[PDB]
């Protein structure tokens, strides 16, 4: 019911929409892993920034 | 030289040439055709030049259709003239060509003779061409 998310690429030069998607999950600097719920609102912020995150399920 | 008898407006923007030719890519009237496999634009003096070379070689019978009409005006600014100060006057007319458009058609001749004549014309055109027969669909 929860998913690991790790930021593996820099936030420099990304679209402001994608910057706020990463900040919306609570990720702040590279190689940071967070505990978030697998809810449809949260699952939609991951897909918008798929190329930046590494999802461990 | 082909060109419209009258136009609503004298000038046009440059525009862009994009996409394939899903319309105008079938052998409709004739029985052998010269299709375009690359995009570009014919300047209505090459269309006219390539038509001498095609009717002269058959020189006995046959019917020929031209499926391309140059209807887009283009402008050129004269020499030793700065930038700005309006838009230049119309010099010549062109036709937008996309990959797959059929240019010339012919019938009433042997298949071997059609191949010869369409090679005469294709050497006057600034784009790649092809030889296409006719199908039911």
């Amino acid at each position: 019911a929860t998913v690991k998310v790790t930021l593996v690429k820099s936030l420099n030069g990304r679209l402001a929409n994608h910057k706020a998607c990463v900040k919306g999950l609570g990720l702040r600097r590279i190689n940071h892993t967070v505990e978030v719920q697998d809810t449809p609102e949260n699952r939609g912020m991951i897909n918008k920034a798929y190329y930046l995150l590494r999802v461990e399920g | 030289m082909l060109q419209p008898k009258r136009t609503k407006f004298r000038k046009q923007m440059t525009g862009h040439n994009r996409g394939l030719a899903h319309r105008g890519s079938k052998v409709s009237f004739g029985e052998y055709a010269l299709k375009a496999t690359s995009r570009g634009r014919l300047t209505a003096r090459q269309i006219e030049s390539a038509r001498r070379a095609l009717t002269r070689h058959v020189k006995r019978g046959g019917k020929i259709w031209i499926r391309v009409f140059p209807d887009k005006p283009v402008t050129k600014k004269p020499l030793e003239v700065r930038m700005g100060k309006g838009k230049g006057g119309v010099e010549y007319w062109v036709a937008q060509i996309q990959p797959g458009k059929v240019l010339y058609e012919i019938e009433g001749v042997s298949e071997e003779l059609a191949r010869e004549a369409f090679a005469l014309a294709a050497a006057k055109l600034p784009l790649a061409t092809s030889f296409v027969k006719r199908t039911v669909m």
């Binding site: - | 899903h22 029985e31 797959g100 039911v136």
Partner: protein
């Protein structure tokens, strides 16, 4: 002969269909018509492209074999690449024993050497059309419609009402009160 093999297609879409033509070398297809749900099938390009140079390819009746379940179909429409010219998509219409169907049938022009307008008057021959929309029962669907141009004079026009048809065959356009030039004779260009 007129045999085609097919497999049941499962992945639909532009990306899935573009992958068949690039990697697998197959062709997407559809089998609709009759009284059934439409079925999406796939077939190999080099086999459909070999059935297509038969002269009576569209006006004949195919024996499609989807998986191991075969049936009766007919080439109803065809999609080709605008530039290269190979076939990309094709749809098949199911054939029912008692049901009217339509098709495109090419015209077999004959004996143009001894036409009166050519041997005597020194004129040309122009085929204005090369196929006719027909409508008939499947049992009497012709491979070709034969037009005879022996007794044709210079300047004489041939329309749909001039040519003969086999039994139980309608020319569709003629039924709409629209008969149109099939072929004609005219003087030489030069």
């Amino acid at each position: 002969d007129f045999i085609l093999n097919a497999q049941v297609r499962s992945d639909l879409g532009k990306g899935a269909s573009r992958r068949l033509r690039r990697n697998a070398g197959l062709v997407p297809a559809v089998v609709y018509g009759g009284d059934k749900e439409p079925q999406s099938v796939t077939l190999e390009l080099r086999e459909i492209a070999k059935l297509l140079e038969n002269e009576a390819a569209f006006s004949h009746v195919i024996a499609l074999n989807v998986g191991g379940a075969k049936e009766t179909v007919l080439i109803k429409a065809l999609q080709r690449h605008p530039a290269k010219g190979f076939v990309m998509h094709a749809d098949f219409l199911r054939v029912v024993a008692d049901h009217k169907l339509t098709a495109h049938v090419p015209l077999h022009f004959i004996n143009e050497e001894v036409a009166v307008g050519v041997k005597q008057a020194g004129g040309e021959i122009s085929h204005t059309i090369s196929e006719v929309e027909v409508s008939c029962l499947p049992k009497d669907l012709p491979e070709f419609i034969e037009v005879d141009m022996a007794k044709v004079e210079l300047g004489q026009i041939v329309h749909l009402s001039d040519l003969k048809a086999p039994k139980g065959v309608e020319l569709v356009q003629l039924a709409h009160g629209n008969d149109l030039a099939v072929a004609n004779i005219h003087a030489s260009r030069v």
